[PDB]
């Protein structure tokens with residue numbers, strides 16, 4: 339599969355993922371009190387030079403984590419859990435999809451000195467989100483704040499998707 | 505190749521560090537001292553991306569050790585110093601990660617030998633001055649200005665951190 343097909347398949351699932359996220363809530367002003375900056379790594383937003391493999395490996399890791407975030411207990415939200423499952427199934431498919439394509443591309447390359455952009459700061463960034471969730475005892479507001487941050491993640495993954503050009 | 509992300513991370517670090525250094529204001533015997541900035545540092549030549557990072561790496565390791573010394577007499581906000589050192593530290597690491605990758609592709613040359621020793625001795629004179637001046641507020645002012653000047657060269661070298 340060319341990078342172009344993967345990139346389109348990504349833009350396409352992101353959009354689907356974002357759509358599902360937008361079918362869970364009804365704005366909560368009260369929750370603005372739990373507002374917290376998680377500081378997505380600066381390179382995810384501003385780095386201008388991404389090689390096809392790096393952007394790909396980066397989105398791969400972001401997805402893996404978004405999956406893990408949403409795998410937590412959202413019961414306190416009252417969200418339609420069906421939609422949550424769709425969101426999860428969708429991301430899971432993108433992850434395994436990306437995995438197979440990277441496996442093919444990377445097979446014969448000089449290592450890849452992989453996630454130079456990814457690993458490092460993404461792991462810590464997501465740790466904050468998780469720690470935040472646990473600290474707030476998975477409250478409905480905590481989920482409202484995270485959901486907004488997750489949507490924000492998707493906004494940047496779309497930016498990253500444009501470096502997947504053939 | 506990881507030099508683009510490195511240089512990105514380096515510009516980010518250069519900005520924060522300088523911003524912080526400039527911020528510091530406190531509550532003098534001289535106000536200016538010559539520490540004989542190594543020709544190596546004020547040397548206008550084209551540093552290959554690997555040497556630019558080597559020099560930058562050596563410069564930061566030393567700058568770290570300097571701001572690590574006791575500055576309680578300056579009245580400077582320790583929180584800012586804590587941040588500056590944190591930043592410097594985290595960046596010395598990225599540089600290390602990248603330099604390690606082609607650690608074997610570089611050879612022991614006199615340019616490298618003389619650059620490491622001259623830099624070591626320069627920061628050496630700097631550390632010695634703080635010590636002799638018992639880490640006074642007036643020695644620290646002189647040192648901060650020196651380090652800010654160091655960063656002018658760090659900016660220049662960071663421009664070679666690409667491709």
Ligand SMILES: *[C@@H]1O[C@H](CO[C@H]2O[C@H](C)[C@@H](O)[C@H](O)[C@H]2O)[C@@H](O[C@@H]2O[C@H](CO)[C@@H](O[C@@H]3O[C@H](CO)[C@@H](O)[C@H](O[C@@H]4O[C@H](CO)[C@@H](O)[C@H](O)[C@H]4O[C@@H]4O[C@H](CO)[C@@H](O[C@@H]5O[C@H](CO)[C@@H](O)[C@H](O)[C@H]5O)[C@H](O)[C@H]4O)[C@H]3O)[C@H](O)[C@H]2O)[C@H](O)[C@H]1O
Pocket residue numbers: 418419420421424
């Ligand atoms: C939370 O969970 C759900 C939210 O997630 C999901 O639904 C969202 C709306 C959607 O955005 C998202 O993609 C999904 O994630 C939410 O909604 C319901 O959940 C499920 C969907 O998975 C649906 O429940 C039933 O599923 C079963 C499948 O085996 C079936 O029992 C049943 O099948 C039919 O399918 C349609 C479409 O889903 C339903 O409208 C009908 O109720 C049902 O049976 C028949 O279907 C047709 C309608 O298509 C009826 O008449 C036709 O209408 C046509 C109109 O153009 C005309 O040609 C003509 O008038 C006639 O042919 C027929 O009379 C009737 O027997 C599903 O009910 C469910 O549909 C979703 O509402 C939950 O509500 C939230 O709590």
Ligand SMILES: *[C@@H]1O[C@H](CO[C@H]2O[C@H](C)[C@@H](O)[C@H](O)[C@H]2O)[C@@H](O)[C@H](O)[C@H]1O
Pocket residue numbers: 581582583584587
């Ligand atoms: C000493 O330092 C901390 C400052 O921490 C920061 O906040 C200011 C507003 C920013 O410009 C700096 O970049 C950060 O270091 C203060 O909270 C404290 O009040 C001050 O005494």
Ligand SMILES: [Zn+2]
Pocket residue numbers: 458459594598
């Ligand atoms: Zn880092």
